[PDB]
Symmetry: C3
Subunit: 298 residues, 3 copies
């Protein structure tokens, strides 16, 4: 895109603040940012806030979100669709033009781990170019296993294709399939979807801990067969809804846009790969590492 | 197929009648019919009754079906396999030759949303050419959420490939992935699997309604990540069996031939896309529209 | 691989023995063996014990497995990952070098139908070349439907690609998708993943029986839409965990590495195909036959 040539906008922090007991303001940007998706390979991504996937949003069940999108792209319109909310797509997920802003208000009344993405036609183009992320809606009454959990992380799976190639997006195999992690607190890792970061800088844990991961497969096109090597999921909650509760799974099937909360134990020290078990995708990048030490540091 | 050149058989209505409290007669045809699957693109489909997917069949749990197939194809044999029934495939799903008829009897003793299709080798060829559909078996005791439901529709997802090309069927990506809707009553829309009808003529609803969709992904080859934009499914029943009950899902994973009953609320007026969230397939046709008005008309 | 040219190692029996009430010794080989995967087509497979998929392992919930792998491959290292166990992947799933042995100890504390495979980088290469199988962990308290079951079989789905072709493994469609069956007792069939054996030599049953199948889709890359023609699954237990219980399904979605216990009735005599309903894969080999007779023999 000629107007994107030499555009590289620096990442903007997510702006959030609570304005009432069940009302929250969120402000995000649409912006064009270069991300290194594999060693030596830059993708000029269409992003929220200069991250792909975008920043993590965490709200509580029953919050109303008053959301503002500032479009920094000089030519392409962008929009936001949150899977968490009930809204009118043709009134509330509409396009925000270049250098313009839009504000929208809608409720999050279901707990879970939800995809968000741009809703601008062709949606495939916006998702594939990087406009995806996750919003977590915390359940009012928690999960039944909350007392047993020691440590929490967020992981997101996405694909990358040949740059802005609609034929490849529609008809091709992914070039790369990747994990990223987003921070539930400062001090947690917060990364972009790339083939290497979570191998070189693993997630940490301590021997004996019960780990909770909040996971979402944003696609755009593939399903995921999510598995942690060396363990079995003790509990699974499909889409993060506490009522959707499975036990003792080896692997969790996730549709495109599907989420889960998964919990498992790590019993021995060592390095534990995290994969999609569709091993063509794992080979193309989708392996993250969990390093489990006798202290929880390293 | 040389004997199909210039054959275009007009659609025949489904013939059904109840002959006892738990016995029902159904008569269907196998016939060759041109269907416009995308603007300007005719597919000479192998069909039941001149529709692809075929006509909707609705029976009650515990009905015995006395089914007749009349084969109008002048050269190719066809057969019927209903997923709803218990039967002997080699005695009851057998081929009916050209210009011949066959009658078969079998029970439907499980509730749900079931695929039907031809069982004639190679089955892939018959399904891909259009010989698929859905049979709904109503549960004797209903669903637990029946009192909350305001409006019901049936949607079916299928793929189309290059015309009668067994290499493409086996090894290729779909050319088109489409939705259709079938009528649960006269006045409901009843359409074929095409890229456009349910965009140009949306399904209707009224603000505030709880909507039930009975859905099946007939394939032949792909899985589906079924999602309604702007809402969250309040309740899901896998394969339409009332015992298989999930809540608060964003997206429902359907195998090839898999079904579901899904229920959701629409809270604001506007146009609500209905997608598979495998967005390469949505881009290739699989977007239907739900128009929600302040009165339920337009 | 030049050191594999003319290597064809004969199949070795699985060596197992119980050494305490909750301790079991298993000894397996890694070996190179020619298997006929389709008529006229030999694949020089990388195998456990000269079978692909490997031999069935059955243990009880809470058993500790003391596992030895003898690597008979003259050049390539191999390793074992059992999905059933809790272990440290970097200490317990490590490579065993050529002509060397390794012993590892880990517990199986969850019931179900679990994949096993090599863990040697690149894992995709080892799985695709044939290093996969299933371990069944029996539940201490059985399944709730155990009294109703008449007959049990194990079926495994896998893919084959162009021989040892990493480009094809990562980017290509499968050449063949196949079922095999493994014996739960001597007298049961025990076969390799090929396009023909379970068509030419069907599984047997008797009219009226409730059949239990323990199934796993080992991949490496595809999902499975598992279906028995002519029946409906009465009960399904996802991953073989008795708590994960669905009823009345037509088709079961399995991720890559996913398992299930499924149970169904066969009401009439005849031949009942067993398929993945992703019919491109069924066309490429994944159809097995169940022959149901008035006596249970033939
Ligand atoms: O309360 N609206 O930003
Ligand atoms: O065992 N997981 O690759
Ligand atoms: O009762 N048979 O058509
Ligand atoms: O939010 N659905 O595309
Ligand atoms: O008890 N170890 O083989
Ligand atoms: O009805 N199964 O192909
Ligand atoms: Cu406000
Ligand atoms: Cu965008
Ligand atoms: Cu979406
Ligand atoms: Cu009759
Ligand atoms: Cu046909
Ligand atoms: Cu079928
Ligand atoms: Cu020992
Ligand atoms: Cu190996
Ligand atoms: Cu594995």
């Amino acid at each position: 895109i000629a107007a994107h040539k030499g555009v590289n906008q620096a990442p903007v922090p997510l702006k959030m603040e609570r304005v009432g007991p069940h009302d929250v303001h969120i402000e995000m940007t649409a912006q064009i940012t270069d991300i290194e998706i594999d060693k030596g390979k830059i993708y000029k991504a269409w992003t929220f806030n200069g991250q792909a996937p975008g920043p993590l949003v965490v709200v509580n069940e029953g919050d109303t979100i008053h959301f503002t999108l500032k479009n920094m792209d000089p030519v392409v319109p962008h929009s936001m669709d949150f899977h968490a909310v009930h809204a009118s797509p043709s009134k509330d997920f509409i396009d925000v033009m270049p250098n313009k802003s839009g504000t929208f208000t809608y409720p999050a009344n279901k707990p879970g781990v939800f995809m968000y993405h741009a809703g601008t036609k062709p949606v495939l183009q916006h998702i594939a170019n990087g406009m995806h992320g996750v919003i977590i809606v915390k359940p009012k009454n928690g999960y039944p296993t909350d007392k047993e959990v020691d440590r929490e992380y967020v992981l997101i799976q996405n694909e990358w294709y040949k740059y802005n190639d609609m034929n490849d997006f529609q008809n091709g195999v992914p070039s790369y399939v990747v994990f990223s992690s987003k921070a539930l607190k400062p001090g947690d890792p917060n990364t972009n979807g790339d083939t290497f970061t979570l191998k070189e800088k693993p997630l940490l844990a301590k021997v004996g801990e019960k780990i909770r991961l909040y996971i979402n497969n944003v696609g755009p096109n593939e399903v995921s067969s999510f598995h942690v090597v060396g363990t079995v999921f003790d509990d699974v909650y499909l889409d993060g809804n506490p009522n959707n509760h499975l036990q003792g799974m080896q692997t969790v099937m996730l549709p495109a846009s599907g989420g889960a909360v998964v919990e498992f134990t790590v019993t021995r020290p060592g390095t534990y790969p995290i994969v999609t078990h569709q091993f063509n995708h794992a080979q193309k990048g989708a392996v993250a590492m969990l390093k489990v030490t006798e202290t929880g540091e390293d």
